[PDB]
């Protein structure tokens, strides 16, 4: 039963019983210490990294040994713990030990009453101390005076030392023996604190232990890190090599053999001092409480509130679980517990300061933004790792712009361009591992409570590194110059708008001239700006004026042109998504919504990246204004994570790869008004580009969104819709009834998909006139698809007569695209027809 009170100071000095994390080792060491005496140098080493609690451990060992020392068969007196870092820089350790030993002895003489025995054993003690003072210069001398030879040849004493000469260890050995007689103890414990704070001063501890602490009446307990003593020992065996030899034999053959010798003298210097059978490894908090399935060797509980009852105290893994899950907006499972495990493997001081800072402000805040509490808690603890890894550190500049830059500068060092945006604690280095949980808190804090910041992190944050894992990585110091150019061109960290990112993102996927020269790309299709001959069928140069209402608005938000030797023109889904990320940010006023469609269309000049060789429109605004009304009351309960945004991009990116190549072929002569799956056109590619985003959001919303604990897709193969709709239709059908079963609505369980499926900007792209897979029986799926969508959003996207025109083989369309199918894709050969 171990309970840690977070509102207590929780310091190594101010830690009483009943909260010792190391209670199994404290008892195990003490009995093993007593066993050694009850049965030669006797040194116990308590291993452990920095912040493990080594000072707190020995502090408990002395407390558990000084109690009932005379009430047990083997009496062991303990000196106060010696801290090698806090001692005077030049004070010998033997001086410190003797000074602390003299105080213990003198205090015992003042407890005696028989003056005959008091005076008999005080003359001996003063004689031994005076003899130690006489020979103390042997340590603090830079030369050997010839007149000291008389001291070695003096025998004017009754000691009758075994070996001749003024051996200081011999003088100290009987000094300890005299002290044991006075204190009436069978041994004396010399506890040495760790040297981790300043480890160059721990050499005197090592040399003193092996020289003067060899007696059977001395028990030495020294803690620290063997990884740190090894560097101290190795650097001192190198000082035994003459400087001239090192300078004259700098070549590898003899240099390597010397290094083999030093590591082979270091190895046995540790084995001589701290024997393996006596070392004790301090267990980190993960090894105590254990995992969910593995039995917890101990039971650690945390008092997360002031005045909390002992029964009320909650388990530490649950306490970390609450902070990690709510702080990162993350749901119970492998991903949430992967962060919790990493926080447990942290040094105890670092972990106990994350919890202390998080739960102190959490309680104080109520007297909420839990992700903000964890962001500040992790910022302070992982600050040394943030500085090392080069992440943003100023707190007045925290925001979306200063976060997407951090995600790019993190995966660049992590080298995980495929899954780095997940921000999982997987990096081998501890600095990048520490930043991963801090960055995850940053993403779960900024994007929380707003849909606009979710899409900016999706495109600018997660996307920018994927648009680097391809289309920029083939060009690769040159790599650091490529990074410098790429982030300056795309202006990540200072983006003007999400749409502005998409237009630059259009060029990089365009300034990489793909094979077959077809102007069909990942999530973007090129369209001709000029008219020529040789165009069969109804294919024609794209004209924006053909579309009406939302149809004109939807393309205007999607069209993006880049200035080059010739003005390329593109229709991307990133521009469509970036437009949504811009409308959501602004207010519900009509004036601001109008500018969103008109931020890029006719006032931007997207020069190619340097790494290249060369009214009814008011009705459209009304629908967007109505949708923005929904966003401002639904997005307040959104809980996006760094995992969800990373996952949603991953599926959305994978689909855009499938639809890119699976439609690079089906661009045949009769593809206009495509009705079979073997014919595709600009209305087909863009329909599944948009439907890819609506699916990636849909499938991994229920999978990973923290608002709904349960899973509503159920168990099955989560195939994604490419050139088809049944894959999307299968999942959207089966989700609907489960919420009715659980008495939950579509908006309070999948707020992200509900908002994006009800966005009028992408509504014309869901059912383009050109893009409809009205097969003999697949049209029933789309008929169900339209019915499901019309019920999710609450409004009929297309009227009964409007739907019949798309399926059955004039009409004006104010809600669906019209001229996209007739558009001519650059680099497409319109000579081969569908067979």
Ligand X SMILES: Nc1ncnc2c1ncn2[C@@H]1O[C@H](COP(=O)(O)OP(=O)(O)OP(=O)(O)O)[C@@H](O)[C@H]1O
Closer by beta carbon to a second copy, 20 or else 432:
432
CA dist., res. 654 & res. 631, Å (int) = 27
Query: Taking CB within 5 to 8 Å according to partner kind, which of a second copy, ligand X, none is near residue 594?
Result: a second copy
CA dist., res. 444 & res. 645, Å (int) = 9
Q: Among the candidate windows 121-129, 681-689, 710-718, 808-816, which touches a second copy by CB under 8 A?
A: 710-718
Helix (H, G, I), strand (E, B) or coil at 494: coil
Contacts with a second copy in 548-587 (CB under 8 A)? 586-587
CA dist., res. 205 & res. 190, Å (int) = 11
Residue 690 in contact with residue 573, Cβ under 8 Å?
A: yes
Tell the smallest beta-carbon distance from residue 307 to ligand X (Å).
19
**Secondary structure letter of residue 540 according to DSSP:** B
Residue 47: strand pairing partners: 224, 281
Closer by beta carbon to ligand X, 56 or else 818:
56
Residue 536 in contact with residue 830, Cβ under 8 Å?
A: yes
Closer by beta carbon to a second copy, 184 or else 589:
589
Tell the smallest beta-carbon distance from residue 775 to a second copy (Å).
23
380 binds ligand X (CB under 6 A): no
301 binds ligand X (CB under 6 A): no
194 binds ligand X (CB under 6 A): yes
The distance from CA 36 to its chain's CA centroid, rounded to whole angstroms, is 45
Residue of 185, 220, 348, 577 that binds ligand X (CB under 6 A): 348
Over its C-alpha atoms, the chain yields an Rg (Å, rounded) of 37
Q: Dihedral angle at the C-alpha atoms of 584, 586, 590, 593, nearest 10 degrees?
A: -60
Residue 562 in contact with residue 568, Cβ under 8 Å?
A: yes
Measured from the Cβ of residue 80, the count of other Cβ atoms closer than 10 Å reads 11
Which two three-digit tokens encode residue 318? 């649950």
Which residues are CB-neighbours of 656 under 8 A, at least 6 positions away?
522, 523, 573, 689, 692
595 binds a second copy (CB under 8 A): yes
705 binds ligand X (CB under 6 A): no
CA dist., res. 366 & res. 635, Å (int) = 23
Contacts with a second copy in 66-125 (CB under 8 A)? none
Residue of 6, 20, 37, 439 that binds ligand X (CB under 6 A): 20
13 binds a second copy (CB under 8 A): no
Closer by beta carbon to a second copy, 140 or else 598:
598
Binding-site size for a second copy (CB under 8 A) equals: 27
Q: Among the candidate windows 13-21, 421-429, 515-523, 597-605, which touches ligand X by CB under 6 A?
A: 13-21
Closer by beta carbon to ligand X, 352 or else 691:
352
197 binds ligand X (CB under 6 A): yes
Closer by beta carbon to a second copy, 166 or else 720:
720
Residue 464 in contact with residue 409, Cβ under 8 Å?
A: no
Residue with tokens 């760790």: 194
**Interhelix angle for 800-807 vs 778-793, to 10°?**
150
Residue 759 in contact with residue 627, Cβ under 8 Å?
A: yes
Closer by beta carbon to ligand X, 355 or else 455:
355
3-state helix, strand, coil in the chain (%, to 5): 55, 5, 40
Residue of 27, 51, 546, 588 that binds ligand X (CB under 6 A): 51
Tell the smallest beta-carbon distance from residue 626 to ligand X (Å).
48
702 binds ligand X (CB under 6 A): no
Residue with tokens 């025998």: 155
Residue 5: strand pairing partners: 303
Query: Taking CB within 5 to 8 Å according to partner kind, which of ligand X, a second copy, none is near residue 293?
Result: a second copy
Residue 381 in contact with residue 348, Cβ under 8 Å?
A: no
Contacts with a second copy in 288-307 (CB under 8 A)? 293
Nearest of 504, 423, 510 to residue 462 by alpha carbon: 423
Tell the smallest beta-carbon distance from residue 270 to a second copy (Å).
26
Tell the smallest beta-carbon distance from residue 587 to a second copy (Å).
8
Residue of 74, 132, 286, 719 that binds a second copy (CB under 8 A): 719
Residue with tokens 């003299």: 102
21 binds ligand X (CB under 6 A): yes
Tell the smallest beta-carbon distance from residue 19 to ligand X (Å).
5
Residue of 606, 660, 697, 828 that binds a second copy (CB under 8 A): 606
Q: Among the candidate windows 78-86, 243-251, 405-413, 712-720, which touches a second copy by CB under 8 A?
A: 712-720
Residue of 709, 715, 800, 831 that binds a second copy (CB under 8 A): 715
53 binds ligand X (CB under 6 A): yes
Residue 214 in contact with residue 169, Cβ under 8 Å?
A: yes
Query: Taking CB within 5 to 8 Å according to partner kind, which of ligand X, a second copy, none is near residue 605?
Result: a second copy
610 binds a second copy (CB under 8 A): yes
- Phi-psi region for residue 390, left (φ > 0), alpha (ψ -120 to 50) or beta? left
Residues binding ligand X (CB under 6 A): 4, 10-12, 15, 19-21, 50-56, 193-194, 196-197, 348-349, 352
Residues binding a second copy (CB under 8 A): 293, 417-418, 469-470, 473, 476, 586-587, 591, 594-595, 598, 601-603, 605-607, 610, 654, 657, 715-719
């Amino acid at each position: 039963k171990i309970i840690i009170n977070l509102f207590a100071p929780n310091l190594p000095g101010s830690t009483k019983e009943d909260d010792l994390i190391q209670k199994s080792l404290r008892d195990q060491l003490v009995e093993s210490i007593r066993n050694s005496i009850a049965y030669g140098r006797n040194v116990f080493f308590v291993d452990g990294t920095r912040g493990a609690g080594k000072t707190t451990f020995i502090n408990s060992v002395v407390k558990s040994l000084n109690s009932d020392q005379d009430d047990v068969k083997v009496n062991i007196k303990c000196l106060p713990t010696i801290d090698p870092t806090k001692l005077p820089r030049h004070e010998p350790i033997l001086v410190t030990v003797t000074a602390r030993l003299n105080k213990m002895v003198s205090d015992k003489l003042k407890g005696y009453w028989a003056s005959n025995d008091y005076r008999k054993q005080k003359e001996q003690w003063q004689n031994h101390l005076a003899q130690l003072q006489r020979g103390l210069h042997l340590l603090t001398d830079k030369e050997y005076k010839p007149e000291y030879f008389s001291d070695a040849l003096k025998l004017d004493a009754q000691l009758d030392y075994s070996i001749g000469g003024q051996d200081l260890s011999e003088i100290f050995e009987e000094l300890v023996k005299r002290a044991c007689e006075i204190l009436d103890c069978k041994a004396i414990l010399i506890t040495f604190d760790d040297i981790d704070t300043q480890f160059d001063a721990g050499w005197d501890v090592l040399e003193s232990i092996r020289k003067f602490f060899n007696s059977r009446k001395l028990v030495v307990v020294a803690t620290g890190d063997l990884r740190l003593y090894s560097q101290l020992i190795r650097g001192k065996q190198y000082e035994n090599y003459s400087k001239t030899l090192l300078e004259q034999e700098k070549e590898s053959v003899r240099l390597a053999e010397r290094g083999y010798m030093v590591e082979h003298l270091e190895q046995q210097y540790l084995l001589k001092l701290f024997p393996v059978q006596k070392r004790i490894q301090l267990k980190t908090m993960l090894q105590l409480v254990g995992e969910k399935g593995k039995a917890g060797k101990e039971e650690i509980k945390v008092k997360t509130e002031p005045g909390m009852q002992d029964i009320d105290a909650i388990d530490v893994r649950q306490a970390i679980g609450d902070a990690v899950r709510e702080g990162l907006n993350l749901r119970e499972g492998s991903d949430a517990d992967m962060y919790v495990n990493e926080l447990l493997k942290q040094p105890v001081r670092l972990l106990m300061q994350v919890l202390q800072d998080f739960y102190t402000k959490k309680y104080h805040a109520t007297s909420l933004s839990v992700p903000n509490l964890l962001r500040n808690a992790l910022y302070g603890s992982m600050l040394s790792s943030i500085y090392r890894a080069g992440l943003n550190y100023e707190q007045h500049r925290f925001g979306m712009d200063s976060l997407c830059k951090d995600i790019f500068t993190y995966v660049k060092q992590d080298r995980d361009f495929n899954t780095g945006f997940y921000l999982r604690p997987q990096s081998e280095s501890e600095a990048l591992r520490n930043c991963s949980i801090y960055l995850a808190s940053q993403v779960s804090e900024n994007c929380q409570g707003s849909l606009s910041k979710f899409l900016q992190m999706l495109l600018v944050g997660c996307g920018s590194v994927s648009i680097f894992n391809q289309f920029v990585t083939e060009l690769a110091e040159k790599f650091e110059q490529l990074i410098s150019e790429y982030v300056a061109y795309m202006s990540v960290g200072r983006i003007e708008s999400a749409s502005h990112w998409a237009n630059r993102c259009c060029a990089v996927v365009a300034n990489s001239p793909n094979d077959e020269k077809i102007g069909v790309f990942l999530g973007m299709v090129q369209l001709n700006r000029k008219s020529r001959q040789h165009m069969p069928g109804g294919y024609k140069k794209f004209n924006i004026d053909t579309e009406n209402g939302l149809a004109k608005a939807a393309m205007a938000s999607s069209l993006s042109t880049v200035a080059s030797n010739n003005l390329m023109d593109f229709c991307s889904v990133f521009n469509l998504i970036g437009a949504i990320a811009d409308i959501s940010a602004c207010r519900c006023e009509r004036s601001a919504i109008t500018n969103a469609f008109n931020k890029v269309i006719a006032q931007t000049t997207c020069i190619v990246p340097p790494w290249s060789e060369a009214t009814e429109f008011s009705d459209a605004i009304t629908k967007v204004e109505q949708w923005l009304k929904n966003v401002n009351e639904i997005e307040i309960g959104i809980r996006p994570s760094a995992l969800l945004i990373g996952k949603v991009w991953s599926r959305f990116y994978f689909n855009l790869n499938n639809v890119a190549d699976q439609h690079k072929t089906r661009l045949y002569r009769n593809a206009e008004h495509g009705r079979m799956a073997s014919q595709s056109n600009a209305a087909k590619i863009m329909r599944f580009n948009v439907l890819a985003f609506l699916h990636a959001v849909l499938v991994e919303e229920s999978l990973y969104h923290s608002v709904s604990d349960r899973e509503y897709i159920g168990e099955g193969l989560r195939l994604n819709p490419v050139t088809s709709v049944d894959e999307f239709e299968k999942k959207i059908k089966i989700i609907g009834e489960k919420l009715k079963a659980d008495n939950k609505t579509w908006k309070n369980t999948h707020p992200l998909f509900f908002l994006l499926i009800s966005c009028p900007i992408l509504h014309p792209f869901i059912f383009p006139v050109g893009g409809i897979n009205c097969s003999v029986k697949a049209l029933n799926k789309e008929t169900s698809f339209n019915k499901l969508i019309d019920e999710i959003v609450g409004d009929k996207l297309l009227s009964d007569e409007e739907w019949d025109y798309l399926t059955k083989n004039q009409q004006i369309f104010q809600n669906t695209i019209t001229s996209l199918n007739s558009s001519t894709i650059v680099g497409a050969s319109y000579d081969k027809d569908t067979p």
